[PDB]
């Protein structure tokens, strides 16, 4: 064939973290929320099978699986950690997923709450016709 193709999609990873007015009965001092979305409320669900948040093993049911948007997790905690996030694609051929190590950090009391955003671009070179159609429907 004479044609080649490169499709590029943008994802926004991010988290919010606030010091609680009163710690939970467990001692947890913060409420946080972490998420994967697309920009402009894009419909990434067209090409995203599921999003998996790998919480620290200290949390109950550490493998949090989101098969349908919003792709997010809301918890309380007391300490920052690295949170591996895996985005699975509605694809049959490589790549079938992409992994990002998300820095879930928390700020001390007396400092402002955390609102963090991290932009990531994914580039698919010569996707199949059906993966390509889903990618571009987003």
């Amino acid at each position: 064939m004479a044609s080649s193709c490169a499709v590029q999609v943008k994802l926004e990873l991010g988290h919010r973290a606030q010091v609680r007015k009163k710690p939970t009965v467990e001692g947890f001092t913060h409420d946080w929320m972490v998420f994967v979305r697309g920009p402009e409320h894009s419909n990434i669900q067209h090409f995203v099978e599921k999003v998996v948040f790998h919480l620290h093993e200290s949390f109950p049911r550490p493998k949090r699986v989101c098969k349908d948007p919003p792709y997010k997790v809301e918890e309380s905690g007391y300490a920052g950690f690295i949170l591996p996030i895996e985005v699975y694609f509605k694809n049959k051929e490589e790549p079938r997923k992409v992994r990002f190590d998300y820095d879930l950090f928390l700020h001390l009391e007396g400092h402002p709450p955390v609102n963090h955003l991290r932009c990531e671009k994914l580039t698919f070179n010569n996707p199949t016709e059906d993966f390509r159609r889903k990618l571009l429907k987003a």
């Binding site: 001092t29 200290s58 300490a79 920052g80 950090f105 700020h107 001390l108």
Partner: peptide, 8 residues
């Protein structure tokens, strides 16, 4: 630091 302690 502005951050809390961390876990691994």
């Amino acid at each position: 630091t502005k951050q809390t302690a961390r876990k691994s």
